[PDB]
PDB file of C-alpha atoms and ligand atoms in Angstrom:
ATOM      1  CA  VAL A   1      -9.931 -73.079 -98.218  1.00 50.49           C
ATOM      2  CA  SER A   2      -8.540 -69.579 -98.688  1.00 50.48           C
ATOM      3  CA  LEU A   3     -10.488 -66.915-100.659  1.00 51.45           C
ATOM      4  CA  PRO A   4      -8.618 -65.752-103.834  1.00 50.99           C
ATOM      5  CA  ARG A   5      -7.525 -62.155-104.299  1.00 49.98           C
ATOM      6  CA  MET A   6     -10.519 -59.811-104.830  1.00 50.69           C
ATOM      7  CA  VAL A   7     -10.780 -56.024-105.253  1.00 49.88           C
ATOM      8  CA  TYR A   8     -13.813 -54.272-103.759  1.00 49.39           C
ATOM      9  CA  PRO A   9     -14.491 -51.001-101.871  1.00 46.29           C
ATOM     10  CA  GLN A  10     -13.001 -50.844 -98.390  1.00 46.92           C
ATOM     11  CA  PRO A  11     -15.575 -51.202 -95.670  1.00 48.98           C
ATOM     12  CA  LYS A  12     -15.651 -48.039 -93.559  1.00 48.85           C
ATOM     13  CA  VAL A  13     -15.788 -48.545 -89.837  1.00 51.02           C
ATOM     14  CA  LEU A  14     -17.070 -45.006 -89.145  1.00 50.75           C
ATOM     15  CA  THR A  15     -19.516 -44.941 -92.083  1.00 53.47           C
ATOM     16  CA  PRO A  16     -22.271 -47.539 -92.038  1.00 54.98           C
ATOM     17  CA  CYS A  17     -24.244 -47.902 -95.330  1.00 56.36           C
ATOM     18  CA  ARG A  18     -27.598 -48.392 -93.525  1.00 58.05           C
ATOM     19  CA  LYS A  19     -28.455 -45.893 -90.797  1.00 58.53           C
ATOM     20  CA  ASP A  20     -32.220 -46.229 -91.283  1.00 60.38           C
ATOM     21  CA  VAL A  21     -32.730 -49.864 -90.090  1.00 59.11           C
ATOM     22  CA  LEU A  22     -31.459 -52.354 -87.496  1.00 61.72           C
ATOM     23  CA  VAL A  23     -28.894 -54.615 -89.193  1.00 60.51           C
ATOM     24  CA  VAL A  24     -28.014 -56.890 -86.283  1.00 60.78           C
ATOM     25  CA  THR A  25     -30.180 -58.478 -83.637  1.00 62.18           C
ATOM     26  CA  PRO A  26     -29.423 -58.268 -79.837  1.00 61.37           C
ATOM     27  CA  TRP A  27     -28.006 -61.798 -80.100  1.00 60.07           C
ATOM     28  CA  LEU A  28     -25.603 -60.693 -82.882  1.00 56.48           C
ATOM     29  CA  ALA A  29     -27.454 -62.287 -85.804  1.00 57.66           C
ATOM     30  CA  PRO A  30     -27.284 -60.156 -88.984  1.00 58.50           C
ATOM     31  CA  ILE A  31     -30.573 -58.802 -90.360  1.00 57.71           C
ATOM     32  CA  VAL A  32     -30.207 -59.055 -94.123  1.00 57.86           C
ATOM     33  CA  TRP A  33     -30.965 -55.820 -95.998  1.00 58.36           C
ATOM     34  CA  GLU A  34     -29.691 -54.483 -99.299  1.00 59.11           C
ATOM     35  CA  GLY A  35     -26.373 -52.627 -98.673  1.00 59.85           C
ATOM     36  CA  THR A  36     -25.268 -54.912 -95.821  1.00 56.92           C
ATOM     37  CA  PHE A  37     -23.502 -57.539 -97.956  1.00 58.72           C
ATOM     38  CA  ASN A  38     -20.996 -57.978-100.746  1.00 56.79           C
ATOM     39  CA  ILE A  39     -22.454 -60.813-102.761  1.00 58.63           C
ATOM     40  CA  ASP A  40     -19.145 -61.503-104.481  1.00 61.23           C
ATOM     41  CA  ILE A  41     -17.464 -62.362-101.210  1.00 59.90           C
ATOM     42  CA  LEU A  42     -20.430 -64.527-100.060  1.00 55.58           C
ATOM     43  CA  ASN A  43     -20.712 -66.328-103.404  1.00 55.71           C
ATOM     44  CA  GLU A  44     -17.035 -67.227-103.259  1.00 54.82           C
ATOM     45  CA  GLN A  45     -17.342 -68.495 -99.692  1.00 51.65           C
ATOM     46  CA  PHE A  46     -20.296 -70.724-100.544  1.00 51.79           C
ATOM     47  CA  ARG A  47     -19.071 -71.975-103.925  1.00 47.50           C
ATOM     48  CA  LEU A  48     -15.748 -73.048-102.349  1.00 46.61           C
ATOM     49  CA  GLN A  49     -17.888 -75.388-100.226  1.00 46.62           C
ATOM     50  CA  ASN A  50     -19.885 -76.667-103.244  1.00 48.46           C
ATOM     51  CA  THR A  51     -23.048 -75.665-101.377  1.00 48.82           C
ATOM     52  CA  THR A  52     -26.325 -77.259-102.395  1.00 49.29           C
ATOM     53  CA  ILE A  53     -29.554 -75.507-101.512  1.00 49.72           C
ATOM     54  CA  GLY A  54     -32.891 -77.372-101.246  1.00 47.00           C
ATOM     55  CA  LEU A  55     -36.029 -75.318-101.982  1.00 48.02           C
ATOM     56  CA  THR A  56     -39.220 -76.938-100.710  1.00 50.20           C
ATOM     57  CA  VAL A  57     -42.793 -75.944-101.755  1.00 52.10           C
ATOM     58  CA  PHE A  58     -46.215 -77.459-101.227  1.00 52.79           C
ATOM     59  CA  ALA A  59     -48.501 -77.199-104.143  1.00 51.45           C
ATOM     60  CA  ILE A  60     -51.897 -78.860-103.414  1.00 50.85           C
ATOM     61  CA  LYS A  61     -55.189 -78.488-105.273  1.00 51.23           C
ATOM     62  CA  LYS A  62     -55.527 -75.086-107.051  1.00 49.53           C
ATOM     63  CA  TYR A  63     -52.053 -74.057-105.885  1.00 52.17           C
ATOM     64  CA  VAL A  64     -50.400 -76.147-108.629  1.00 52.98           C
ATOM     65  CA  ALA A  65     -51.351 -73.212-110.858  1.00 51.73           C
ATOM     66  CA  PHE A  66     -48.624 -71.094-109.218  1.00 56.11           C
ATOM     67  CA  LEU A  67     -45.761 -73.464-109.983  1.00 57.23           C
ATOM     68  CA  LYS A  68     -44.862 -72.211-113.412  1.00 56.92           C
ATOM     69  CA  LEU A  69     -44.311 -68.578-112.361  1.00 58.43           C
ATOM     70  CA  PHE A  70     -42.647 -69.671-109.099  1.00 58.13           C
ATOM     71  CA  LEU A  71     -40.086 -71.928-110.778  1.00 59.37           C
ATOM     72  CA  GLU A  72     -39.393 -69.724-113.810  1.00 59.78           C
ATOM     73  CA  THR A  73     -38.635 -66.723-111.568  1.00 61.43           C
ATOM     74  CA  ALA A  74     -36.618 -68.914-109.156  1.00 62.11           C
ATOM     75  CA  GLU A  75     -34.449 -69.832-112.192  1.00 60.49           C
ATOM     76  CA  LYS A  76     -33.799 -66.147-112.745  1.00 55.55           C
ATOM     77  CA  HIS A  77     -33.184 -65.057-109.172  1.00 55.67           C
ATOM     78  CA  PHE A  78     -32.740 -67.831-106.607  1.00 58.14           C
ATOM     79  CA  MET A  79     -29.188 -68.969-105.817  1.00 60.54           C
ATOM     80  CA  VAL A  80     -28.007 -68.431-109.403  1.00 58.33           C
ATOM     81  CA  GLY A  81     -24.548 -70.049-109.727  1.00 58.12           C
ATOM     82  CA  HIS A  82     -25.076 -72.532-106.953  1.00 55.41           C
ATOM     83  CA  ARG A  83     -26.480 -76.036-106.854  1.00 58.51           C
ATOM     84  CA  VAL A  84     -30.241 -76.039-106.284  1.00 58.19           C
ATOM     85  CA  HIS A  85     -32.592 -78.905-105.677  1.00 58.06           C
ATOM     86  CA  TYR A  86     -36.270 -78.053-105.920  1.00 56.63           C
ATOM     87  CA  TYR A  87     -38.664 -80.300-103.952  1.00 59.42           C
ATOM     88  CA  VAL A  88     -42.249 -79.972-105.045  1.00 58.63           C
ATOM     89  CA  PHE A  89     -44.757 -81.718-102.727  1.00 58.21           C
ATOM     90  CA  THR A  90     -48.033 -82.100-104.629  1.00 57.99           C
ATOM     91  CA  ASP A  91     -51.219 -84.136-104.943  1.00 56.19           C
ATOM     92  CA  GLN A  92     -51.099 -83.643-108.742  1.00 59.30           C
ATOM     93  CA  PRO A  93     -47.731 -84.775-110.045  1.00 61.14           C
ATOM     94  CA  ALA A  94     -48.949 -84.660-113.689  1.00 60.05           C
ATOM     95  CA  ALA A  95     -49.953 -80.979-113.313  1.00 63.09           C
ATOM     96  CA  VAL A  96     -46.369 -79.872-112.372  1.00 62.92           C
ATOM     97  CA  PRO A  97     -45.244 -77.735-115.319  1.00 61.71           C
ATOM     98  CA  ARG A  98     -42.186 -78.588-117.357  1.00 60.07           C
ATOM     99  CA  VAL A  99     -39.896 -75.633-116.628  1.00 62.84           C
ATOM    100  CA  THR A 100     -36.435 -75.515-118.154  1.00 62.83           C
ATOM    101  CA  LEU A 101     -33.705 -75.430-115.507  1.00 65.93           C
ATOM    102  CA  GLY A 102     -30.145 -74.080-115.499  1.00 63.19           C
ATOM    103  CA  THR A 103     -27.173 -76.370-115.124  1.00 66.55           C
ATOM    104  CA  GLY A 104     -26.680 -77.772-111.649  1.00 65.12           C
ATOM    105  CA  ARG A 105     -30.397 -77.321-110.780  1.00 65.30           C
ATOM    106  CA  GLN A 106     -32.740 -80.220-110.313  1.00 65.43           C
ATOM    107  CA  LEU A 107     -36.392 -80.741-109.535  1.00 62.94           C
ATOM    108  CA  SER A 108     -38.010 -83.624-107.653  1.00 63.88           C
ATOM    109  CA  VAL A 109     -41.770 -84.161-107.491  1.00 64.95           C
ATOM    110  CA  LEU A 110     -42.955 -85.791-104.264  1.00 65.17           C
ATOM    111  CA  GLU A 111     -46.536 -87.034-104.272  1.00 68.14           C
ATOM    112  CA  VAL A 112     -48.626 -86.404-101.208  1.00 65.55           C
ATOM    113  CA  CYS A 113     -37.579 -87.501 -96.730  1.00 66.94           C
ATOM    114  CA  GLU A 114     -35.598 -86.848 -93.531  1.00 67.67           C
ATOM    115  CA  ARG A 115     -32.524 -88.979 -94.312  1.00 67.42           C
ATOM    116  CA  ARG A 116     -32.837 -88.043 -98.035  1.00 69.27           C
ATOM    117  CA  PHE A 117     -32.476 -84.285 -97.350  1.00 71.67           C
ATOM    118  CA  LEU A 118     -29.448 -84.939 -95.132  1.00 73.96           C
ATOM    119  CA  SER A 119     -27.644 -86.625 -97.936  1.00 75.00           C
ATOM    120  CA  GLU A 120     -28.830 -84.380-100.850  1.00 74.61           C
ATOM    121  CA  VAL A 121     -28.574 -80.780 -99.688  1.00 72.36           C
ATOM    122  CA  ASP A 122     -26.648 -78.607 -97.226  1.00 68.41           C
ATOM    123  CA  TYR A 123     -29.459 -76.092 -96.549  1.00 68.32           C
ATOM    124  CA  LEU A 124     -33.179 -76.189 -96.763  1.00 69.04           C
ATOM    125  CA  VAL A 125     -35.446 -73.264 -97.547  1.00 68.65           C
ATOM    126  CA  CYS A 126     -39.204 -73.570 -97.005  1.00 66.47           C
ATOM    127  CA  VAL A 127     -41.480 -71.142 -98.886  1.00 70.08           C
ATOM    128  CA  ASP A 128     -45.069 -70.690-100.124  1.00 70.40           C
ATOM    129  CA  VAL A 129     -45.729 -71.433-103.795  1.00 72.23           C
ATOM    130  CA  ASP A 130     -48.095 -68.490-104.481  1.00 73.01           C
ATOM    131  CA  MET A 131     -45.120 -66.147-104.804  1.00 74.68           C
ATOM    132  CA  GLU A 132     -42.642 -64.952-107.399  1.00 72.66           C
ATOM    133  CA  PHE A 133     -39.043 -63.947-107.326  1.00 70.78           C
ATOM    134  CA  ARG A 134     -38.463 -60.381-108.588  1.00 69.46           C
ATOM    135  CA  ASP A 135     -34.844 -59.843-107.583  1.00 69.29           C
ATOM    136  CA  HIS A 136     -31.758 -61.540-106.157  1.00 70.60           C
ATOM    137  CA  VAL A 137     -32.277 -64.149-103.398  1.00 73.02           C
ATOM    138  CA  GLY A 138     -28.921 -65.708-102.762  1.00 74.35           C
ATOM    139  CA  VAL A 139     -26.372 -67.169-100.380  1.00 69.66           C
ATOM    140  CA  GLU A 140     -26.540 -64.115 -98.116  1.00 68.14           C
ATOM    141  CA  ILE A 141     -29.569 -65.856 -96.490  1.00 62.88           C
ATOM    142  CA  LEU A 142     -27.724 -69.060 -95.666  1.00 60.07           C
ATOM    143  CA  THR A 143     -26.952 -69.855 -92.026  1.00 57.94           C
ATOM    144  CA  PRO A 144     -27.779 -72.547 -89.497  1.00 58.05           C
ATOM    145  CA  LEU A 145     -31.255 -71.177 -88.788  1.00 58.95           C
ATOM    146  CA  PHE A 146     -33.150 -68.207 -90.314  1.00 59.96           C
ATOM    147  CA  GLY A 147     -36.532 -66.623 -90.303  1.00 61.39           C
ATOM    148  CA  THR A 148     -38.075 -63.712 -92.205  1.00 58.30           C
ATOM    149  CA  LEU A 149     -39.812 -60.594 -90.821  1.00 57.91           C
ATOM    150  CA  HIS A 150     -43.506 -60.559 -91.521  1.00 57.79           C
ATOM    151  CA  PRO A 151     -44.100 -57.564 -93.840  1.00 56.73           C
ATOM    152  CA  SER A 152     -47.211 -56.364 -92.023  1.00 59.36           C
ATOM    153  CA  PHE A 153     -45.511 -56.256 -88.605  1.00 60.77           C
ATOM    154  CA  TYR A 154     -41.922 -55.186 -88.961  1.00 61.22           C
ATOM    155  CA  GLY A 155     -42.747 -51.695 -87.580  1.00 62.80           C
ATOM    156  CA  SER A 156     -45.151 -52.890 -84.870  1.00 60.32           C
ATOM    157  CA  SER A 157     -44.688 -53.147 -81.133  1.00 60.55           C
ATOM    158  CA  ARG A 158     -44.826 -56.732 -79.860  1.00 59.61           C
ATOM    159  CA  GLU A 159     -48.222 -56.354 -78.168  1.00 59.83           C
ATOM    160  CA  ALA A 160     -49.645 -55.987 -81.716  1.00 57.22           C
ATOM    161  CA  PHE A 161     -47.976 -59.196 -82.979  1.00 59.19           C
ATOM    162  CA  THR A 162     -50.574 -61.917 -83.692  1.00 60.54           C
ATOM    163  CA  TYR A 163     -48.714 -64.573 -81.699  1.00 60.17           C
ATOM    164  CA  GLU A 164     -50.705 -67.310 -79.997  1.00 61.41           C
ATOM    165  CA  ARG A 165     -52.034 -65.632 -76.839  1.00 63.91           C
ATOM    166  CA  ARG A 166     -53.910 -68.546 -75.095  1.00 68.15           C
ATOM    167  CA  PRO A 167     -51.743 -69.964 -72.242  1.00 71.92           C
ATOM    168  CA  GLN A 168     -53.142 -73.440 -72.860  1.00 73.48           C
ATOM    169  CA  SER A 169     -51.363 -73.530 -76.232  1.00 72.13           C
ATOM    170  CA  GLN A 170     -47.794 -74.837 -76.619  1.00 73.36           C
ATOM    171  CA  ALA A 171     -47.243 -71.812 -78.964  1.00 70.45           C
ATOM    172  CA  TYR A 172     -48.211 -69.346 -76.209  1.00 71.42           C
ATOM    173  CA  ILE A 173     -46.245 -66.162 -76.071  1.00 68.45           C
ATOM    174  CA  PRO A 174     -47.147 -63.587 -73.388  1.00 66.10           C
ATOM    175  CA  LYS A 175     -47.568 -59.914 -74.203  1.00 66.79           C
ATOM    176  CA  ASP A 176     -44.203 -58.914 -72.689  1.00 66.04           C
ATOM    177  CA  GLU A 177     -42.143 -61.377 -74.767  1.00 68.97           C
ATOM    178  CA  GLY A 178     -41.129 -61.437 -78.423  1.00 69.65           C
ATOM    179  CA  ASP A 179     -38.262 -60.112 -80.536  1.00 68.82           C
ATOM    180  CA  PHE A 180     -39.931 -60.148 -83.945  1.00 68.14           C
ATOM    181  CA  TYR A 181     -42.974 -61.425 -85.749  1.00 67.90           C
ATOM    182  CA  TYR A 182     -41.638 -63.925 -88.333  1.00 67.97           C
ATOM    183  CA  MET A 183     -43.736 -64.993 -91.293  1.00 67.48           C
ATOM    184  CA  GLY A 184     -44.686 -68.661 -91.152  1.00 66.26           C
ATOM    185  CA  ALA A 185     -43.129 -69.159 -94.510  1.00 67.12           C
ATOM    186  CA  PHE A 186     -39.666 -68.335 -95.821  1.00 67.22           C
ATOM    187  CA  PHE A 187     -37.687 -69.976 -93.097  1.00 64.28           C
ATOM    188  CA  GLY A 188     -34.720 -72.326 -93.432  1.00 68.02           C
ATOM    189  CA  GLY A 189     -31.287 -73.261 -92.348  1.00 68.39           C
ATOM    190  CA  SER A 190     -29.062 -76.313 -92.258  1.00 68.14           C
ATOM    191  CA  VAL A 191     -30.925 -79.507 -92.886  1.00 63.62           C
ATOM    192  CA  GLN A 192     -30.250 -80.522 -89.248  1.00 64.92           C
ATOM    193  CA  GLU A 193     -31.695 -77.271 -87.896  1.00 65.47           C
ATOM    194  CA  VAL A 194     -34.725 -77.274 -90.147  1.00 65.07           C
ATOM    195  CA  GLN A 195     -35.434 -80.894 -89.127  1.00 65.29           C
ATOM    196  CA  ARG A 196     -35.157 -79.960 -85.439  1.00 68.47           C
ATOM    197  CA  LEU A 197     -37.577 -77.141 -85.937  1.00 68.30           C
ATOM    198  CA  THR A 198     -40.108 -79.155 -87.867  1.00 69.09           C
ATOM    199  CA  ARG A 199     -39.909 -81.972 -85.340  1.00 72.61           C
ATOM    200  CA  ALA A 200     -40.513 -79.482 -82.510  1.00 73.50           C
ATOM    201  CA  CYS A 201     -43.439 -77.817 -84.317  1.00 72.66           C
ATOM    202  CA  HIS A 202     -45.035 -81.180 -85.146  1.00 71.18           C
ATOM    203  CA  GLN A 203     -44.758 -82.364 -81.481  1.00 73.93           C
ATOM    204  CA  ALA A 204     -46.247 -79.085 -80.160  1.00 74.74           C
ATOM    205  CA  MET A 205     -49.093 -79.222 -82.728  1.00 72.06           C
ATOM    206  CA  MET A 206     -49.973 -82.753 -81.510  1.00 70.88           C
ATOM    207  CA  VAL A 207     -50.042 -81.668 -77.885  1.00 71.78           C
ATOM    208  CA  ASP A 208     -52.351 -78.708 -78.707  1.00 70.59           C
ATOM    209  CA  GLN A 209     -54.588 -81.154 -80.703  1.00 69.40           C
ATOM    210  CA  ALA A 210     -54.723 -83.568 -77.734  1.00 71.02           C
ATOM    211  CA  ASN A 211     -55.745 -80.568 -75.576  1.00 68.49           C
ATOM    212  CA  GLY A 212     -58.502 -79.562 -77.978  1.00 67.80           C
ATOM    213  CA  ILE A 213     -56.858 -76.345 -79.208  1.00 70.91           C
ATOM    214  CA  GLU A 214     -56.072 -75.377 -82.882  1.00 71.20           C
ATOM    215  CA  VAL A 215     -54.504 -68.593 -84.055  1.00 73.53           C
ATOM    216  CA  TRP A 216     -52.218 -68.762 -87.136  1.00 74.62           C
ATOM    217  CA  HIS A 217     -51.261 -72.517 -86.980  1.00 76.02           C
ATOM    218  CA  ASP A 218     -47.817 -72.879 -88.604  1.00 75.32           C
ATOM    219  CA  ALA A 219     -46.806 -69.214 -87.937  1.00 73.81           C
ATOM    220  CA  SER A 220     -47.657 -69.242 -84.215  1.00 72.84           C
ATOM    221  CA  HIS A 221     -45.523 -72.404 -83.591  1.00 73.19           C
ATOM    222  CA  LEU A 222     -42.713 -71.126 -85.767  1.00 75.27           C
ATOM    223  CA  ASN A 223     -42.693 -67.884 -83.798  1.00 73.38           C
ATOM    224  CA  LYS A 224     -42.529 -69.734 -80.479  1.00 71.67           C
ATOM    225  CA  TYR A 225     -39.613 -71.867 -81.748  1.00 66.76           C
ATOM    226  CA  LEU A 226     -37.685 -68.864 -82.975  1.00 66.94           C
ATOM    227  CA  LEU A 227     -38.287 -67.026 -79.692  1.00 65.97           C
ATOM    228  CA  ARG A 228     -36.697 -69.920 -77.837  1.00 67.08           C
ATOM    229  CA  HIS A 229     -33.990 -70.907 -80.415  1.00 67.65           C
ATOM    230  CA  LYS A 230     -32.847 -67.579 -81.771  1.00 66.68           C
ATOM    231  CA  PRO A 231     -32.156 -67.512 -85.529  1.00 66.99           C
ATOM    232  CA  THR A 232     -28.566 -66.993 -86.687  1.00 66.69           C
ATOM    233  CA  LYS A 233     -29.787 -64.620 -89.468  1.00 67.99           C
ATOM    234  CA  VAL A 234     -33.029 -62.689 -89.865  1.00 69.59           C
ATOM    235  CA  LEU A 235     -34.230 -61.745 -93.356  1.00 68.77           C
ATOM    236  CA  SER A 236     -35.667 -58.250 -93.879  1.00 70.50           C
ATOM    237  CA  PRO A 237     -39.056 -57.816 -95.575  1.00 73.31           C
ATOM    238  CA  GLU A 238     -37.262 -57.399 -98.874  1.00 69.99           C
ATOM    239  CA  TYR A 239     -37.474 -61.189 -98.807  1.00 68.92           C
ATOM    240  CA  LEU A 240     -41.222 -61.521 -98.240  1.00 69.00           C
ATOM    241  CA  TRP A 241     -43.310 -58.640 -99.578  1.00 70.09           C
ATOM    242  CA  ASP A 242     -46.810 -57.888-101.104  1.00 73.02           C
ATOM    243  CA  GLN A 243     -46.601 -54.812-103.236  1.00 72.95           C
ATOM    244  CA  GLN A 244     -50.383 -54.672-103.923  1.00 73.60           C
ATOM    245  CA  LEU A 245     -51.169 -54.688-100.189  1.00 75.40           C
ATOM    246  CA  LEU A 246     -48.158 -52.736 -98.845  1.00 76.73           C
ATOM    247  CA  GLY A 247     -46.704 -50.605-101.615  1.00 74.12           C
ATOM    248  CA  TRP A 248     -42.997 -49.946-102.006  1.00 70.99           C
ATOM    249  CA  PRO A 249     -41.761 -48.003 -99.048  1.00 70.21           C
ATOM    250  CA  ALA A 250     -38.411 -46.192 -99.029  1.00 71.58           C
ATOM    251  CA  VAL A 251     -36.922 -48.592 -96.514  1.00 72.47           C
ATOM    252  CA  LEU A 252     -37.038 -51.359 -99.201  1.00 76.93           C
ATOM    253  CA  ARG A 253     -34.330 -50.853-101.796  1.00 77.37           C
ATOM    254  CA  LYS A 254     -35.270 -54.143-103.438  1.00 77.30           C
ATOM    255  CA  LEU A 255     -38.441 -56.269-103.541  1.00 80.80           C
ATOM    256  CA  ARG A 256     -37.004 -59.766-103.938  1.00 80.92           C
ATOM    257  CA  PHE A 257     -39.808 -62.286-103.322  1.00 77.99           C
ATOM    258  CA  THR A 258     -43.427 -61.257-103.463  1.00 76.57           C
ATOM    259  CA  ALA A 259     -47.072 -62.312-103.348  1.00 77.20           C
ATOM    260  CA  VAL A 260     -48.789 -63.072-106.602  1.00 76.91           C
ATOM    261  CA  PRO A 261     -52.388 -61.772-106.916  1.00 79.69           C
TER     262      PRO A 261
HETATM  263 HG1  LIG B   1     -22.660 -51.337 -95.288  1.00 80.42          HG
HETATM  264 HG1  LIG B   2     -39.036 -77.389 -95.604  1.00 80.45          HG
HETATM  265 HG1  LIG B   3     -42.147 -76.178 -97.372  1.00 78.53          HG
HETATM  266 HG1  LIG B   4     -42.342 -75.077 -82.722  1.00 75.71          HG
HETATM  267 HG1  LIG B   5     -43.114 -74.661 -87.384  1.00 82.64          HG
END
């Protein structure tokens, strides 16, 4: 359907807002930074499709302790205005805190789903639970397949990336290959694309197991997948930061989703 009439500042062809960072990859995927998007336009586009976002987190053992802060801050900052379905995978269903949710937002507790996700949500986002939302994380991220720049490596040359470097591993990436180092958390996309990815990772993990090989497990396989199946958006480190470890450098105008000491 058509967008309604909207009044906003004219984009200026000969005046980019961000001259300090790369905002598009060499395969023409946007790299999402503050100042690259008009959230009003994006919100309209996604609400006209009645978009439902699934947010998946694993909270096992001591990590259940992070759920309250995670969910309360997600209520304040994550996809506000859109339909959200939280999926909490946990070994302690009775320890999941009762957090009050906005309208159109639901939570499911799964005790520790393929067809279920296909029928319940349009996008899936996969994050770590020991995190909090500090600022807007919205529909600007949504796309068939996305990953997030690792905050420790976004300025590094690829030789420094801690990819899997053993050729015997399915996740092997040689020193002369690599676009980016993606964090092995905060990835997502359409349900179909996220299922393809997770299927691929699980198959490759089995093969490495069978060959007696186990560096960064989920992150090394993710990085191999995203090297071979290029993401359709890349999230800047605004979306995955640790202020205690890394500070607040000028290049980050917002710190949206961060580590919790
Ligand atoms: Hg801009
Ligand atoms: Hg997921
Ligand atoms: Hg997940
Ligand atoms: Hg993979
Ligand atoms: Hg993976």
